[PDB]
Design an enzyme around this catalytic site. Structure first.
Site, mmCIF file in Angstrom:
data_model
loop_
_atom_site.group_PDB
_atom_site.id
_atom_site.type_symbol
_atom_site.label_atom_id
_atom_site.label_comp_id
_atom_site.label_asym_id
_atom_site.label_seq_id
_atom_site.Cartn_x
_atom_site.Cartn_y
_atom_site.Cartn_z
ATOM 1 N N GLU A 1 -6.223 2.884 1.930
ATOM 2 C CA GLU A 1 -6.380 4.388 2.314
ATOM 3 C C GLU A 1 -6.542 5.259 1.071
ATOM 4 O O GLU A 1 -5.701 5.867 0.764
ATOM 5 C CB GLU A 1 -5.310 5.218 3.178
ATOM 6 N N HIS B 1 -3.070 -4.953 -2.884
ATOM 7 C CA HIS B 1 -3.206 -4.591 -1.349
ATOM 8 C C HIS B 1 -3.784 -3.014 -1.766
ATOM 9 O O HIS B 1 -2.824 -2.199 -1.206
ATOM 10 C CB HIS B 1 -2.235 -4.804 -0.547
ATOM 11 N N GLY C 1 0.731 -1.260 0.159
ATOM 12 C CA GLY C 1 0.039 -0.164 -0.021
ATOM 13 C C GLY C 1 0.801 1.252 -0.003
ATOM 14 O O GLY C 1 1.263 1.885 1.055
#
Ligand SMILES: [Zn+2]
Lengths: 454, 79, 78, 156
Positions: free
Chosen positions: D73, D70, D42
């Site tokens: 946010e 993955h 991420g």
């Protein structure tokens, strides 16, 4: 009092009611006199216990049956499935099988014979009909002495397709007659590939042609009872070549995007079929940016990556085009790493037995398997989702029933369960929605009862 | 509800004795299946007289037609 | 003209539907009112300077559809 | 699964090492514990968003290594679109905004691309409502994904 204990009964026998099996009673004084009209209830009860024994016997091993409804078969009938398919004795059983058609071209159906004339005689403008060219079939057709290659194969269908289907009357005949061929073959779900821009004219846009094709099949579907109705979905073929005109691909890709949301019910456009000229110049990645709009609108892609004996083209089809199905692709075993990827990702392989035999040639009726055999059983053993299709009902001069039976001669020892597993694979590989898949699965549960088992 | 089903033969007294399985409460209704035999015909009335002097549950002495004696397999399947 | 709206890092599926609709409609109607081009409009920024839309618009160019572009709220000549 | 982490700054040398490590270990072990795929970890934003690494992951696809992406946010569906098609990801991590693109949700379910949901982490990072009455505009999309035919997995 000696009590033998409560009896729970049997699950499907305790629901029976008196009105279903009435008992005629004649009243003599205060005492009833009862009689049975027939022996129906015992025939129902014993048929239930006969089926209940089958389910419990086949209960341990139900995961190996592609169709769960087969667990109600007698154990002798289930042993019959695991026996190798007999091409001459199982013709009737295969004919009655509800089949799935994933690779079928509209333009290669009524290419010769009586069907070619039946399409021609219904032309709206007979004066514009092209002369019937002399295209002699190779000797032994549909089983030639030697493979004819891809160039000669496509020339066998020169009396139909773009030459004939620009006529609205011929296009209607071709669609309705093809549906009649599907119904005669007990096909339950079919995906027909068409090139609507190939049949477009000055006054007839490709959208007009495609709408006519869809409504010809939709009208044929609606006229058929739900029990034996063949659901037809449409794939649009994007044909690649050496230069010339690739605005036709943009027209077909745009047509399939437009048609995708237009029809949400009945016959509908469910994917594109990248096909045409097979070469390292026209390999899949060359069109990767053309199919980004196709992927954004959720249209499935199948790829004709199966003639040039390449494996690099199949790599782009899986990874650069995100193809959900691979047409032909008879050389997956050349790359054992690509074979693992195809099986792992669920990418289905569309095998066309007669067309592959006619174009490529494969050893036939060999009692052992090695290094040249049709890769159907090798693909199945590797976990590849394999489907069997007709490719061209006219050029190949074989139905889906004949293609299934040819796998007995192409692949030694292929069992009748493996034929059933390909139909299940084709149902899973179909570009169908939830309503179409549910309706198709209910049809596949009705496997014909074999005759002359053991 | 509690329903008692009792087949009967040449021993009509089994049904009134079968009445006493549950005790004083008895059964809400009892139904008796009978064959068309003439030998067991007198027992049918004996059941009727017992039912009259012990009323309250529904009674049925339904007799199976064209079943006189157990002769072959077809008789049993008919019953 | 059918408007292909640029949206910030968003769905290019509506652009694909609009560009495909124009290609289908350009040859559907040859007389009267007809679809003659596409408009590239919507959000405009250094991310959407429309060089990376060139792949989306090659099919439009193949079928002879004209293109007009919105120079949006910006002071960029690029 | 070997994790290739996207980084702000363009540093791709550790990604090259992790991707090369997974290719080497993929055929090294054929029994027992083995390396079976790569995870693209991420960092969000259009920079370091999937398709930027499509060139990096061509070797991974060529050796039969599966890819899971993955997401973290972020609230963009373009990353999921590029993960599915540019990256050929077989699984998606924290794909909590599939419903916002109806075409993407159908594609995910049709292709059998699994979605790795992490209930506690999603609650702790994004903050979904708890013990609500029926549904609506805030609920965890697990039951919405299941009704759409999405292969959903729950993870730690
Ligand atoms: Zn074909």
């Amino acid at each position: 009092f000696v009590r033998l204990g409560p009896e729970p009964g049997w699950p499907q026998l305790r629901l029976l009611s008196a009105p279903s099996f009435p008992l005629e009673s004649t009243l003599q004084g205060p005492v009833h006199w009862v009689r049975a009209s027939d022996m129906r209830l015992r025939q129902h009860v014993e048929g239930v216990l006969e089926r209940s024994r089958h389910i419990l016997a086949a209960w341990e091993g139900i995961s190996e049956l592609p169709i769960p409804a087969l667990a109600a078969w007698p154990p002798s009938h289930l042993r019959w499935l695991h026996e190798p398919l007999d091409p001459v004795q199982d013709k009737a059983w295969v004919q009655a099988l509800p089949k799935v058609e994933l690779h079928c071209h509209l333009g290669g159906f009524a290419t010769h014979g009586e069907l070619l004339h039946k399409v021609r005689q219904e032309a709206a403008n007979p004066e514009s009909l092209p002369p019937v060219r002399a295209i002699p079939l190779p000797p032994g057709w549909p089983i030639p002495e030697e493979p004819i290659g891809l160039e000669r194969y496509m020339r066998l269908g020169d009396n139909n397709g773009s030459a004939l289907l620009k006529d609205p009357g011929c296009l209607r005949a071709q669609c309705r007659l093809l549906y009649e061929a599907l119904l005669a073959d007990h096909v339950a779900y079919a995906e027909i590939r068409c090139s609507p821009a190939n049949y477009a004219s000055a006054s007839r846009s490709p959208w007009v042609v495609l709408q006519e094709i869809r409504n010809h099949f939709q009208q044929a579907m609606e006229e058929t009872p739900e029990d034996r109705r063949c659901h037809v979905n449409l794939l649009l073929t994007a044909t690649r070549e050496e230069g010339g005109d690739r605005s036709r691909i943009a027209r077909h890709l745009a047509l399939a995007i437009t048609a995708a949301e237009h029809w949400k019910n009945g016959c509908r456009v469910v994917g594109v079929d990248l096909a045409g000229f097979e070469d390292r110049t026209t390999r899949a990645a060359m069109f990767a940016t053309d199919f980004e709009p196709v992927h954004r609108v959720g249209l499935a892609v199948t790829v004709h990556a199966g003639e040039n004996d390449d494996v690099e083209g199949i790599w782009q089809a899986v990874f650069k085009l995100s193809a959900r199905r691979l047409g032909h692709a008879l050389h997956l075993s050349r790359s054992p790493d690509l074979l693992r990827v195809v099986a792992e990702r669920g990418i289905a392989v569309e095998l066309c037995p007669y067309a592959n035999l006619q174009i490529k040639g494969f050893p036939l009726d060999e009692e052992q398997e090695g290094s040249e055999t049709y890769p159907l059983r090798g693909y199945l053993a590797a976990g590849v989702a394999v489907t069997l299709n007709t490719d061209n009902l006219g050029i190949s001069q074989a139905s889906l029933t004949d293609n299934l039976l040819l796998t007995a001669r192409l692949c030694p020892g292929i069992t009748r369960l493996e034929v059933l597993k390909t139909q299940v694979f084709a149902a899973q590989a179909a570009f169908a929605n939830q309503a179409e898949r549910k309706a198709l699965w209910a049809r596949l549960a009705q496997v014909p009862v074999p005759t002359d088992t053991e | 509800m509690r329903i008692l089903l009792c087949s009967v033969g040449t021993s009509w007294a089994v049904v009134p004795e079968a009445m006493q399985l549950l005790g004083s409460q008895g059964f809400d209704e009892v139904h008796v299946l009978t064959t068309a035999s003439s030998k067991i015909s007198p027992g049918v009335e004996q059941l009727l007289r017992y039912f009259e002097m012990h009323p309250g549950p529904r009674f049925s002495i339904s007799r199976v037609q064209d079943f006189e004696d157990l002769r072959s397999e077809q008789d049993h399947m008919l019953f």
